[PDB]
Amino acid sequence: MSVIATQMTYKVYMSGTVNGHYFEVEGDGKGRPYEGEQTVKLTVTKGGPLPFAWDILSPQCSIPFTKYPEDIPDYVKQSFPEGFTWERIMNFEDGAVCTVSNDSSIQGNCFTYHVKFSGLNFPPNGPVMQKKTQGWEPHSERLFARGGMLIGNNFMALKLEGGGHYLCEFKTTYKAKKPVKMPGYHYVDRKLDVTNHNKDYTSVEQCEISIARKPVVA
Amino acid sequence: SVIATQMTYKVYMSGTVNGHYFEVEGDGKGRPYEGEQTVKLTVTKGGPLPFAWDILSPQCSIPFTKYPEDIPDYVKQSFPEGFTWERIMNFEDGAVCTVSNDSSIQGNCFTYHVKFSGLNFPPNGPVMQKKTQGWEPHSERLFARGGMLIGNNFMALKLEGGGHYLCEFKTTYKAKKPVKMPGYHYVDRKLDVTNHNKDYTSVEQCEISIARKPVVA
Amino acid sequence: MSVIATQMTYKVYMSGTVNGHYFEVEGDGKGRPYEGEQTVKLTVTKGGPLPFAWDILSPQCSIPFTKYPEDIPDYVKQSFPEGFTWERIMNFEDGAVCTVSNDSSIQGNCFTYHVKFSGLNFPPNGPVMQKKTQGWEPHSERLFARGGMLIGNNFMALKLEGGGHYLCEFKTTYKAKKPVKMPGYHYVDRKLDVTNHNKDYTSVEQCEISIARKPVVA
Amino acid sequence: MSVIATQMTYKVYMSGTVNGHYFEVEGDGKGRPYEGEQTVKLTVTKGGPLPFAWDILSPQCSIPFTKYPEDIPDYVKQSFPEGFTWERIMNFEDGAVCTVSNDSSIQGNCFTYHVKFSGLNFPPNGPVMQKKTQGWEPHSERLFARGGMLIGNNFMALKLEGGGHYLCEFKTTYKAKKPVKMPGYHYVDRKLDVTNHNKDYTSVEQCEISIARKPVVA
Ligand SMILES: [Cl-]
Ligand SMILES: [Cl-]
Ligand SMILES: [Cl-]
Ligand SMILES: [Cl-]
Ligand SMILES: [Cl-]
Ligand SMILES: [Cl-]
Ligand SMILES: [Cl-]
Ligand SMILES: [Cl-]
């Protein structure tokens, strides 16, 4: 509030393994935390070119940049300056599973995100390992308070080259490092776009819009 | 077309919850194109039910969903041949239900035949102890696959004394003939039990359902 | 051996739906409860010829016929004459789910099983709806006590025409209708064999051997 | 086939995160690969004392040490000298999920295991974060061949302080780095015993017996 300015930058440090292939990624992002608008530029710094779809990593690259209306408590923004962690499970319909963890901290006008990524049982002839994916559909996260924590669930879908969808379910648990005022039951609508990349996706630029709201029919 | 701006319907439901057998009959009406409907349910066999009415309320009407013109309406197109649905419900304490529906049309009246099977509800959990207080408004992600419409919802039952009891629905809609398939979209709903008797052997509920594109797109 | 004779008969009544297809089945069985051997003959009395693999129904057609060594409490036999129920979830690797409930009672020398079967989301071109299955691999149930109940889990596999397996996970909860002495952590090994059938599986004969044991390596 | 000696040593290097908490572990093992007997000494080298049950790490600390009968192809031993990887998903009954990967290689008389562990959504008041677990029951893996890989499934159970079990399912995929002769459907029975440890589990000694077999009732 005082803590988070209307324009902020951030830094992403991600490392992990997909089917045992190790990688590191660094990003530089910026956006407007109260408008729910952000952009980031990512470089694969280790283990590139990645032999799997960039798309599984794009949503691990920024929760404080969500536009919350005044009458819904904003759990993440409240968690600063101490900050918060998040823990994500991703269950893909062909049996692949990822677990992703983030620590999020603030230094002046900059957030820092440390992300560990672990994914496996992606089928070798499936669309992640053959790189046949073409972006996530726009998605919606169901959010509710439980034991001091914010719990989110999304039905996600990757568009497939040649048509059709490849489904994934996200469960993300957000954990503020102090007690904050808990929101009621609500949603966050997002779209995540890859707006630029080089040929082997060792460089990527992404755009996201995130807006909290009440249920549409209530 | 086939579907009038005002329609009634009849629900015949039967099934078992933790092995306890029941039948329910219902009388509904609403406006298919406005996504508004109301039903009165009677437990006709196996009442009073020793579990929460709320697990049955979402099984009692897909034609009554307001579709905008630029989103094909899968279900309404399936008439007069009609359609079936197959639902799985996975509750967070391990309970699972499988529910199947057949929907048909006779003039001005739909008929829904519903078979419900739920089990592994913990004897001391909120369903068996009747501690649930209705569903949160919910949202269904819908997409097309192999001529079928596949829906998924994160549902939540409100609990007496506070907190939620979670359930994930997967519902697959199967038109009995080919129809024009819609793109990726959502349906928002609110289901409210507006009346009931002391033991929930008689229940009235009201549902609003509205289709839309993604909000942020 | 005062409630359960060394030779018993049984009657099965099963009804249910698969992908909305309604059916009924009746069976006459016989066996040696203490030897863990049994045979049953089944007839599809309503809804036949069934448009799906008989194999999804075969395991639902008799727990009292399991050979328990003397030093492992036999939850199911102890429940008699009052009897017991079971509740089963079946999760198939292509997304199909079944839920099955049984009530088991005893009248003299005969058990009666009432079974309600509900299965759905079987892909139209998958192995069940296309009848491509060729019996169940021999299987093992992991069994432990909790809350006065016996809880069982099995990794099951259907053999496929042309090679390969089609996987299914079972979870079965056994509920004695009176309190009984609870067994420790143990296993039941079974093999279910279809030994005869007519061309459309409207008549089926099955044999099952079931023997309880302690962990092999302990 | 004597790339693998009758007595062998190994080195384990494990790193990972549990609920965001980073750790590293090193171990020194020895055993008899043809007898399915092995023991290992573990040291938490970074991030100790760990704020969670050692027990969730103990099964990530040795597949070549399984006794195979001659008439069951031994997928893992055949993989050497090229070796193999494995990818494991653990689903705990209270919603916790871990993803574990291993690379296994051989140099002379010594195996080297590199293991990456990612666990999260352990409830703060659950038995893992409150350290209420007292070892794994002996367990049994169902194994079959698929697409040149070996697929395994176990129903596991941790014993609890005060009585009761805390359940976990393991799905493990073994991937040989060259083609090998594939086994039919079979099981491996194991017991994993922590035979010594210090007060905060920063040092641990473990013993494992593993033996493959055909189905007991077939
Ligand atoms: Cl895989
Ligand atoms: Cl709370
Ligand atoms: Cl239960
Ligand atoms: Cl389609
Ligand atoms: Cl289907
Ligand atoms: Cl007990
Ligand atoms: Cl948690
Ligand atoms: Cl193979």
Q: SS3 for C145-185, per residue?
A: EECCEEEEEEEEEEEECCCCEEEEEEEEEEEECCCCCCCCC
Which chains border C (3 or more CB–CB pairs < 8 Å)? B, D
C-alpha angle C61-B15-B192 in degrees, rounded to nearest 5: 150
- Three-state SS for A54? helix
Find, among B57, B53, B78, the residue nearest to B149 by Cα.
B78
Taking CA atoms, C1 is separated from B50, C163, D37, in Å, by 35, 44, 42
Q: Which residues crowd ion ligand 5, with CB under 5 Å? A: C 121
Find, among C65, C133, C49, C152, the residue nearest to C93 by Cα.
C133
Find, among C158, C175, C178, C176, the residue nearest to C167 by Cα.
C158
Task: Give residues after which chain D gaps, C-N over 2.5 angstroms.
Answer: 61
B178 touches chain C (CB under 8 A): no
Pair B90, B96: CB distance under 8 Å: yes
Which position has the token pair 């935390």?
A33
Contact C140 D164 (CB under 8 A): no
Experimental method: X-ray
Chain-centre distance of CA D73, in angstroms?
20
User: How far is the C-alpha of C140 from the C-alpha of C142, rounded, in Å?
Assistant: 7
Residues of C in contact with B18 (CB under 8 A): 87, 101
- Please name the residues between 136 and 165 in chain C that touch chain D, using a CB distance below 8 Å: 137-140, 142, 144, 146, 153, 155, 157, 164-165
Residue type, B178: P
Pair B38, B61: CB distance under 8 Å: no
Domains and CATH numbers, chain C: 1-218 (2.40.155.10)
Q: Which of C60, C90, C99 is the best substitution to test chain B (most B C-beta atoms within 10 A)?
A: C99
Taking CA atoms, C217 is separated from B167, C155, C181, D153, in Å, by 39, 19, 25, 17
Strand partners, B187: B140, B211
b/e map of D132-156 (b: 16 or more CB within 10 Å)?
bbbbbbbbbbbbbbeeebbbbbbbb
Contact B98 C103 (CB under 8 A): no
Pair C160, C131: CB distance under 8 Å: no
Answer whether the bond into residue A183 is a cis peptide, omega within 30°: no
Q: How many CB atoms lie within 10 A of CB C109?
A: 11
Give the DSSP letter of residue B66: B
User: How far is the C-alpha of A5 from the C-alpha of A111, rounded, in Å?
Assistant: 11
The residues, any chain, with a CB within 8 Å of residue B80's CB and separated by 6 or more, are B2, B105
Find, among C38, C43, C40, C37, the residue nearest to C14 by Cα.
C43
* Shortest Cα distance, chain C CAs vs residue D91, angstroms: 14
Query: What is the pairing mode between strands B164-175 and B185-196?
Result: unpaired
Pair C78, C172: CB distance under 8 Å: no
Contact B98 C119 (CB under 8 A): yes
User: What count of Cα atoms within 13 Å lies in the side-chain half-sphere of residue B199?
Assistant: 9
Q: Which helix (H) or strand (E) holds C75?
A: helix C75-78
Which position has the token pair 């992600």?
B141
Query: What is the pairing mode between strands B109-119 and B7-17?
Result: parallel
Pair C40, C206: CB distance under 8 Å: yes
Q: Which helix (H) or strand (E) holds A75?
A: helix A75-78
Residues of B in contact with A142 (CB under 8 A): 139, 154, 156
Residue type, A143: L
Contact A157 B139 (CB under 8 A): no
User: How far is the C-alpha of B209 from the C-alpha of B67, rounded, in Å?
Assistant: 9
Find, among A149, A144, A136, the residue nearest to A61 by Cα.
A136
What does the DSSP assignment read for B85-151? EEEEEEETTS-EEEEEEEEEEETTEEEEEEEEEEE---TTSTTTTT-EEEEPPEEEEEEEETTEEEE
Measured between CA atoms, the residue of chain A closest to residue B166 is A144
Chain-centre distance of CA A209, in angstroms?
11
Contact A16 D119 (CB under 8 A): no
The token pair at B131 is: 């501690």
Residue of D137, D210, D211 lying closest to C185 (CB–CB): D137
Residues of D in contact with A97 (CB under 8 A): 89, 97, 99
Give the DSSP letter of residue A49: S
User: How far is the C-alpha of D155 from the C-alpha of D90, rounded, in Å?
Assistant: 10
User: How far is the C-alpha of A63 from the C-alpha of A81, rounded, in Å?
Assistant: 14
Residue of A153, A213, A217 lying closest to B154 (CB–CB): A153
Which position has the token pair 């928002």?
B188
Contact B212 A217 (CB under 8 A): no
Contact D19 A173 (CB under 8 A): no
Contact B100 C20 (CB under 8 A): yes
